Amino acid sequence: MSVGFIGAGQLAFALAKGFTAAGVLAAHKIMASSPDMDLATVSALRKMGVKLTPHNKETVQHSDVLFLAVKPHIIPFILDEIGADIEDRHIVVSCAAGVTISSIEKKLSAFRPAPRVIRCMTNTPVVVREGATVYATGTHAQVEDGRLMEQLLSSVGFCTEVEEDLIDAVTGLSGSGPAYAFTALDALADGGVKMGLPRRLAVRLGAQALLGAAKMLLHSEQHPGQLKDNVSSPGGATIHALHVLESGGFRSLLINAVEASCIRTRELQSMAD
């Protein structure tokens, strides 16, 4: 099976790297296109052995599964350019935030009546095969298309099917989530440096703390509040730190973040539903 990426940015690189590292795809069975071959993401794809072309039509012609890994406002232009090149064999997988299946189908149906469309929301940790991916299947997607998508994206992280109307909320949580974590890790490392740790050790310890806690929750049947309770001895260091987080409304900031990203995603839709 052949996979193509229209777009050669961060997400295209991340998925190609994860897929090849998972061994589910050989790099030479992957083609990516970009109007700008000066991006550092483009240089990395070449070293992997991925085929690169400036022409989106070559990617379509090479590919069976076609990832649209461009910005939401770029999607309509891509569909207009390649719509006449879509064949019965194609599964079109849109990764753009906010852009609906119905808007993609409407554009592509002007060329051929039953395009097979899947919408996904994934995130950059697919590059280390620890992504979080959801997908929704379109009107003309065959039942085996969703199954194929799930097999492919499970090789690079968690993957599950969702109703499409949950995907904007997923974007606010796991799509944007890694950036909340990178911010948190930078700040935790600054806190370690303030208290006397070298910066490189502080970054390592903070990231290991967050990785281990996340793994504990994924493997636990217990509520995150119970795991939190297990860390704190009474009167101790951890509960003193949890108080100062609470006094700043830490929980509310993270709710604000998921909400803000989800609401912005709804504003990003570029085409008519």
Ligand X SMILES: O=C(O)CCc1nccs1
Using CB under 8 A as the binding rule, the residues of this chain from 146 to 175 that contact a copy of itself are 157-158, 160, 162, 165-166, 168-175
Site for ligand X in 227-246 (CB under 6 A): 232-233, 236-238
Q: Residue 122 interacts with ligand X (CB under 6 A)?
A: yes
The binder of a copy of itself chosen from 26, 49, 238, 272 (CB under 8 A): 238
Q: Which is nearer to a copy of itself, 148 or 210 (CB)?
A: 210
Residue type, 260: A
- Element of type H or E holding 95: none
Q: How far apart are CA 30 and CA 20, in angstroms?
A: 9
User: Quick check: 89 binds a copy of itself (CB under 8 A)?
Assistant: no
Which one of 147, 227, 272, 273 is in contact with a copy of itself (CB under 8 A)? Answer: 227
- Per CB under 8 A, contacts with a copy of itself among 19-78 are 71
- Of 95, 117, 127, 141, the one binding ligand X by CB under 6 A: 95
Buried-exposed string 206-227: b where 16+ CB fall within 10 A, e elsewhere: bbeeeeeeeeeeeeeeeeeeee
Question: Which does residue 185 bind out of ligand X, a copy of itself, none, counting CB within 5 to 8 angstroms by kind?
Answer: a copy of itself
Residue 266 in contact with residue 171, Cβ under 8 Å? no
Q: Is 174 annotated as a binding residue?
A: no
Stretch that binds a copy of itself, among 44-52, 100-108, 146-154, 185-193 (CB under 8 A): 185-193
Q: Is the dihedral of CA 57, 61, 62, 66 positive or negative?
A: positive
Question: Residue 82: which of 49, 52, 110, 121 has the closest Cα?
Answer: 110
Q: Does 10 bind ligand X (CB under 6 A)?
A: no
Distance, in Å, from the CA atom of 133 to the CA atom of 170, rounded to the nearest integer, reads: 9
Is residue 191 a known part of a binding site? no
**Total binding residues for ligand X by CB under 6 A?**
14
> Closer to ligand X at the Cβ: 2 or 232?
232
What contacts 73, CB < 8 A, 6 or more positions away? 268, 270
- Judged by CB, which is closer to a copy of itself: 13, or 33? 13
Distance between the two ends of the chain, CA-based, in angstroms?
Answer: 31
* 59 phi-psi bin (left φ>0, alpha ψ -120 to 50, beta other): alpha
**What is the spatial distance between Cα 268 and Cα 263, in angstroms, rounded to a whole number?**
9
Q: Is 134 annotated as a binding residue?
A: no
Residues 92 and 86 sit within 8 Å (Cβ to Cβ): yes
206 annotated to bind ligand: no
If you search the block for the tokens 């979080």, which residue do you land on? 132
CB 82 within 8 A of CB 57: yes
What residues between 185 and 214 interact with ligand X by CB under 6 A? Answer: none
Q: Which does 95 bind (CB under 5 to 8 A by kind): ligand X, a copy of itself, none?
A: ligand X
- Per the annotation, where are the binding residues for NADP(+)? 6-11, 34, 56, 69-72, 95-97
Tell me which residues touch ligand X (CB under 6 A).
Answer: 11, 95, 97, 121-123, 171, 175-176, 232-233, 236-238
Known binding-site residues equal: 6-11, 34, 36, 56, 69-72, 95-97, 164, 230, 237-238
